[PDB]
PDB file of C-alpha atoms in Angstrom:
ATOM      1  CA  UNK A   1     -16.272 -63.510 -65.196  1.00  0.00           C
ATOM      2  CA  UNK A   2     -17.598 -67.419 -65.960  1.00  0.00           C
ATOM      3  CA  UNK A   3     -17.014 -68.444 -69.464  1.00  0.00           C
ATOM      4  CA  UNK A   4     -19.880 -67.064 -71.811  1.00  0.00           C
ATOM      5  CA  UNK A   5     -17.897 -65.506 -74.514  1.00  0.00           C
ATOM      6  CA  UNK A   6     -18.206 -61.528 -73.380  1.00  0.00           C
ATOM      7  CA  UNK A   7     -16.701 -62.431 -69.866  1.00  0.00           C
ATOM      8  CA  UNK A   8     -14.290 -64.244 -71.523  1.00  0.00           C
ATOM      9  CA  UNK A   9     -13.350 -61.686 -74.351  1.00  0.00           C
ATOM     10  CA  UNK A  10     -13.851 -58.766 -72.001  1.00  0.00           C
ATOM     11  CA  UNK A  11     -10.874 -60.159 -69.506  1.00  0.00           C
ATOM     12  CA  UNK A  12      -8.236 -61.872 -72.318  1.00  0.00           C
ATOM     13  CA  UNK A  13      -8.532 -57.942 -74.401  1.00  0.00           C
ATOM     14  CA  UNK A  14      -7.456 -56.265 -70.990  1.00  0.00           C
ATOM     15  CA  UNK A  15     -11.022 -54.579 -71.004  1.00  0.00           C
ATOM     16  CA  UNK A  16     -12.060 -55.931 -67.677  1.00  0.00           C
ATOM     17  CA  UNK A  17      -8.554 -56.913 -65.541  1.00  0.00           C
ATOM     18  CA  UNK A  18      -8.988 -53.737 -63.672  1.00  0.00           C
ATOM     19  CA  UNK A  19     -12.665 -52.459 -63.724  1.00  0.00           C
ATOM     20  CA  UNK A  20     -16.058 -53.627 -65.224  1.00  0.00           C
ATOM     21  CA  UNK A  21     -16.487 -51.933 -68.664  1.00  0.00           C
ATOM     22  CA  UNK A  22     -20.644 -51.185 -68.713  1.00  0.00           C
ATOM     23  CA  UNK A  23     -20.992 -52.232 -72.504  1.00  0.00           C
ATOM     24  CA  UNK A  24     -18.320 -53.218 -75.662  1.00  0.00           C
ATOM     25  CA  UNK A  25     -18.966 -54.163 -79.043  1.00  0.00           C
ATOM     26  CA  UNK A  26     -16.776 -57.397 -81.009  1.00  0.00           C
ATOM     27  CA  UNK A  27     -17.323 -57.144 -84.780  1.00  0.00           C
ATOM     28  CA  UNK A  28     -16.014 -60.460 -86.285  1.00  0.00           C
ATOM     29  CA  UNK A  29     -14.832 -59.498 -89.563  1.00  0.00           C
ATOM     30  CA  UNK A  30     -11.392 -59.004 -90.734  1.00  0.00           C
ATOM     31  CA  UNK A  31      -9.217 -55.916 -89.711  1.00  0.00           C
ATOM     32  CA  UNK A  32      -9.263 -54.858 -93.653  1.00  0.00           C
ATOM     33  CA  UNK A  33     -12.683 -55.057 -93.983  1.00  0.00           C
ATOM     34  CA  UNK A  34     -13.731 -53.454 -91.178  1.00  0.00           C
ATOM     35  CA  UNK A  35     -10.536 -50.357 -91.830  1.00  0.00           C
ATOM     36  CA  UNK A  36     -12.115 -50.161 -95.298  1.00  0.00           C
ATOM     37  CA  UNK A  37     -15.216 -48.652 -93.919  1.00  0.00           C
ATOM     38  CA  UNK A  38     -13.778 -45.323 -93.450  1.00  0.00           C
ATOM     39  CA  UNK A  39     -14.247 -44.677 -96.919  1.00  0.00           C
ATOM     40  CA  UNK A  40     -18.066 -45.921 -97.168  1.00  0.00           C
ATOM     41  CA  UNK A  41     -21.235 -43.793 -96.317  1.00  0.00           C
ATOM     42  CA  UNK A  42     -19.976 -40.472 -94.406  1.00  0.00           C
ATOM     43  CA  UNK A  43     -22.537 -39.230 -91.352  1.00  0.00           C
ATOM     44  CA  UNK A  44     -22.364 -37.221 -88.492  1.00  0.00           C
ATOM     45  CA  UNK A  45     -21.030 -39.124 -85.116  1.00  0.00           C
ATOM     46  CA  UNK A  46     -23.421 -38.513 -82.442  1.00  0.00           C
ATOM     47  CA  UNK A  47     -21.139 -35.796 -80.655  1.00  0.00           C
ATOM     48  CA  UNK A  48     -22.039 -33.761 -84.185  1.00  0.00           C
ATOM     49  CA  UNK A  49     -18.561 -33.972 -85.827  1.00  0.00           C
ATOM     50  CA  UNK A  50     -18.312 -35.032 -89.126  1.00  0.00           C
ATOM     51  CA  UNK A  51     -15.603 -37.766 -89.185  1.00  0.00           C
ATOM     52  CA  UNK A  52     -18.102 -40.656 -89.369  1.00  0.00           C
ATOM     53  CA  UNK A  53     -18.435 -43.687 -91.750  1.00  0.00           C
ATOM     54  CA  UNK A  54     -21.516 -46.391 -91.935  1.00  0.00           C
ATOM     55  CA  UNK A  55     -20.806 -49.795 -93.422  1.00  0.00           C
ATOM     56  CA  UNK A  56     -22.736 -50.184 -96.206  1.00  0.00           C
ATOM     57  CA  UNK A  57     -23.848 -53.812 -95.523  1.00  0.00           C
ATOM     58  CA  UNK A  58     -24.518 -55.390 -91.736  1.00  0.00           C
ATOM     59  CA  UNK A  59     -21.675 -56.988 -90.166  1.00  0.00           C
ATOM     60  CA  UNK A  60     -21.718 -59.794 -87.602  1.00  0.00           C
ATOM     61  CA  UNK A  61     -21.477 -58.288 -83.983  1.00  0.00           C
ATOM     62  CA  UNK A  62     -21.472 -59.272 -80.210  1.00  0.00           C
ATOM     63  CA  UNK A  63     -22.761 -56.725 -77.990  1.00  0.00           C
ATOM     64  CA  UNK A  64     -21.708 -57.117 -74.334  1.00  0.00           C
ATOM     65  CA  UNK A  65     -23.521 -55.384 -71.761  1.00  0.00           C
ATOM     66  CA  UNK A  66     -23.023 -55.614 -67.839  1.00  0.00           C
ATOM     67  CA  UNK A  67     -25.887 -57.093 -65.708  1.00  0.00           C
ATOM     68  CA  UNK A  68     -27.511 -55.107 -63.169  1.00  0.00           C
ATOM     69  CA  UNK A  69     -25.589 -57.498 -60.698  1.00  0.00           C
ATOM     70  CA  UNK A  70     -22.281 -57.136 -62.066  1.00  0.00           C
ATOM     71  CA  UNK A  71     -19.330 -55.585 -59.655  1.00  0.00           C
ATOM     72  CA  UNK A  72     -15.635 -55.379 -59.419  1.00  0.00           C
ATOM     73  CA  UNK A  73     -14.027 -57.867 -59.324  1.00  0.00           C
ATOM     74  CA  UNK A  74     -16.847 -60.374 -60.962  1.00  0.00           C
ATOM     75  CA  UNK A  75     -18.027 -58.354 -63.869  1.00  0.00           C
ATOM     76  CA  UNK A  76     -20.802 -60.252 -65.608  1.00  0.00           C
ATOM     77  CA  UNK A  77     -22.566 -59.528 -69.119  1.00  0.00           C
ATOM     78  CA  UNK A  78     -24.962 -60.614 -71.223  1.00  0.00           C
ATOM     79  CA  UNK A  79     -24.019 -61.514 -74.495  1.00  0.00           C
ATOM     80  CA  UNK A  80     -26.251 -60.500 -77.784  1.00  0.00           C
ATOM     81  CA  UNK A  81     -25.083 -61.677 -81.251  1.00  0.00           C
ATOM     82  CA  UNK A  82     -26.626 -59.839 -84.164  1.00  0.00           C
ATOM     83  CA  UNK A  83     -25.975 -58.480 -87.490  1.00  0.00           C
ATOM     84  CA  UNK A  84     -26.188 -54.849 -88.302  1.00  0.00           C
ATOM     85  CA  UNK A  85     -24.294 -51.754 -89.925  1.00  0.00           C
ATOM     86  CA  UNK A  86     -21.320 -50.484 -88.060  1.00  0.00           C
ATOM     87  CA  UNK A  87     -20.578 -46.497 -87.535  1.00  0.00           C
ATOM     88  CA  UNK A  88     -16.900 -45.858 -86.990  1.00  0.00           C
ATOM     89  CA  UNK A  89     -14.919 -42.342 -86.486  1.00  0.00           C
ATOM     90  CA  UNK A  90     -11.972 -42.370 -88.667  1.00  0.00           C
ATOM     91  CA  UNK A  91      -8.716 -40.344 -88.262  1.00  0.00           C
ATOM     92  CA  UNK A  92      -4.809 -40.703 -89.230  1.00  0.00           C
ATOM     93  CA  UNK A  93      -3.071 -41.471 -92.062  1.00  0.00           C
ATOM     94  CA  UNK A  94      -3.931 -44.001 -93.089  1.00  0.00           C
ATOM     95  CA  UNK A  95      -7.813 -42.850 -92.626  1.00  0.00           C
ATOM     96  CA  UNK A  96      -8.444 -45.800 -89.671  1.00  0.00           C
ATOM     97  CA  UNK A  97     -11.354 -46.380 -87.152  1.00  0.00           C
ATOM     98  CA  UNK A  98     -10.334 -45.006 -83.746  1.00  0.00           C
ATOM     99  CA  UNK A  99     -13.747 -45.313 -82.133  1.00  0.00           C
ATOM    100  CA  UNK A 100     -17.067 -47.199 -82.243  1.00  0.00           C
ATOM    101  CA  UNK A 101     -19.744 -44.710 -83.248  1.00  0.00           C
ATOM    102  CA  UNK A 102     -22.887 -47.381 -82.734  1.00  0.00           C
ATOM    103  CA  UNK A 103     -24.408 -50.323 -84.614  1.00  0.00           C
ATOM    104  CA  UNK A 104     -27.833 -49.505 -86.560  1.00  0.00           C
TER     105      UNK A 104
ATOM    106  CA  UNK B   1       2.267 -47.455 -75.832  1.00  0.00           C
ATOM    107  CA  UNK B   2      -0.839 -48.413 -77.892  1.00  0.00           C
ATOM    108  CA  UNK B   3      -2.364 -46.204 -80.448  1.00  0.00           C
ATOM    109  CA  UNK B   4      -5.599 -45.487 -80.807  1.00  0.00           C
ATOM    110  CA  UNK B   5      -5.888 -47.204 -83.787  1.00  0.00           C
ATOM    111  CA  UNK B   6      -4.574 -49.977 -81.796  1.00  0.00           C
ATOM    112  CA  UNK B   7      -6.843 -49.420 -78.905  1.00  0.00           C
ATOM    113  CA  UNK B   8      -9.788 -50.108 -81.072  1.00  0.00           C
ATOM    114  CA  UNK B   9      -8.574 -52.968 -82.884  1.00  0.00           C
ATOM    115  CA  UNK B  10      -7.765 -54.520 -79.079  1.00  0.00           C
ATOM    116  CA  UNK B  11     -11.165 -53.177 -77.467  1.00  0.00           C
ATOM    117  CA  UNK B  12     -13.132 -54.163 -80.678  1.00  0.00           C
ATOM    118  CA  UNK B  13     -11.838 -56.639 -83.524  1.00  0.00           C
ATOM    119  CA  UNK B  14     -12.136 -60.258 -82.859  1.00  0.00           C
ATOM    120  CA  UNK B  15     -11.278 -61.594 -86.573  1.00  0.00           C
TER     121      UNK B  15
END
């Protein structure tokens, strides 16, 4: 928990206050944009259900995943920026994302 | 308390 932007974002979002999460993905886009992907390419989630959306174009991400030497209380990550196609499951009314499917 | 619509937004969004 020492300033690189995962520690940082993990701890202010309540993510790692009371555990160490192993891995979380930030998509920097806006809310809208990234809610209006529930009505772009439909695919399977990986669990087999069919309530899955891909973005159609990459979108920029931060992957944060623990280090091997990371435990409670000092979580630690290391921090990968990339851009690449988000998958979403979508439920409610309105259709929203509710969970992260992956990043491809 | 938080939806999960919320949840993700918290867990995932960083606009």
């Amino acid at each position: 928990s020492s300033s690189n932007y995962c520690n940082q974002m993990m701890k202010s979002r309540n993510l790692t206050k009371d555990r160490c999460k192993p891995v979380n993905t930030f998509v920097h886009e806006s809310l809208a944009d990234v809610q209006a992907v529930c009505s772009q390419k439909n695919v399977a989630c990986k669990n087999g259900q069919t309530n899955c959306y891909q973005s159609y174009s990459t979108m920029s991400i931060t992957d944060c995943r623990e280090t091997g030497s990371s435990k409670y209380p000092n979580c630690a990550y290391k921090t990968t920026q990339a851009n690449k196609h988000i998958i979403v499951a979508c439920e409610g009314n309105p259709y929203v994302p509710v969970h992260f499917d992956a990043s491809v | 308390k938080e939806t999960a619509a919320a949840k993700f937004e918290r867990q995932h969004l960083d606009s």
